Design a binder for this molecule. Structure first.
Ligand code: ZN
Length: 259
């Protein structure tokens, strides 16, 4: 079959066997070379409208945990920046490390952060998520780096329920979560065309990666690292290092929103 993971034999280096697009022209993540990434003055202001965001549930899918949202109307939408039209938030999740010095998928001048938050939106041009993922302009993912320092109050509600979804397949109701509480103070960003960073690795993503990291506490990070890849009863495999390394940039240019 096409089971995949982050281990020695089922991890990113081997994904291509089952998902040949893994060696495609627009794979993610990438290293962001700040020297070559040029200001684009044509990028419009980035707009997030999250006041009416409706979170539904949190689940451990054996690779990460996802917080899922009602995307049936324009209640949590990303617009502007590089984007044409309206993108609805469907879910967010994180990637993180076993150690603070690794965990991010994107890197900045080769620097790795402790983790990376992905807020996943899809383009209402296409009428549902399934249709959007099949298109180069189908998704917009807002990438937010985490470093370890001061606790992040707006993360605490997430961290506080991770004990209920320790293992693969677990889910719980998760309402009234405000994703605005996960944002940094500056929304300066880089953007480039790329892919899902997990199988099926489709090249449907406009990446928007914020320059300014959020700070989270070592306590919050420790809670992430206590999660399991495995299901209940199976041998323990700590959910850590669920990040894909930098892929070749190939022909692509990375644009900066800031002068
Ligand atoms: Zn992700």
């Amino acid at each position: 079959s096409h089971h995949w993971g982050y281990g020695k034999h089922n991890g990113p280096e081997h994904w291509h066997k089952d998902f040949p697009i893994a060696k495609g022209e627009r794979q993610s993540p990438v290293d962001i070379d700040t020297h070559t990434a040029k200001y684009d003055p044509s990028l419009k202001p980035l707009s997030v409208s999250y006041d009416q965001a409706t979170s539904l549930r949190i689940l451990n899918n054996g690779h990460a945990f996802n917080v899922e949202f009602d995307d049936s109307q324009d209640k949590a939408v990303l617009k502007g920046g590089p984007l044409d039209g309206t993108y609805r938030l469907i879910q967010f999740h994180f990637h993180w490390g076993s150690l603070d010095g690794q965990g991010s998928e994107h890197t900045v001048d080769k620097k790795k952060y402790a983790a990376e938050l992905h807020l996943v939106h899809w383009n209402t041009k296409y009428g549902d998520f399934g249709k959007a993922v099949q298109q180069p302009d189908g998704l917009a993912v807002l990438g937010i780096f985490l470093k370890v320092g001061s606790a992040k109050p707006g993360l605490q509600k997430v961290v506080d329920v991770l004990d209920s979804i320790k293992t693969k397949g677990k889910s719980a109701d998760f309402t009234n979560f405000d994703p605005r509480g996960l944002l940094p103070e500056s929304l300066d960003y880089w953007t480039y065309p790329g892919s899902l960073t997990t199988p099926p690795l489709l090249e449907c993503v406009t990446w928007i990666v914020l320059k300014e990291p959020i700070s989270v506490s070592s306590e919050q990070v420790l809670k992430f690292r206590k999660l399991n890849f495995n299901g209940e009863g199976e041998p323990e495999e700590l959910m850590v290092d669920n990040w894909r390394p930098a892929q070749p940039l190939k022909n692509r240019q990375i644009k900066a929103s800031f002068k």
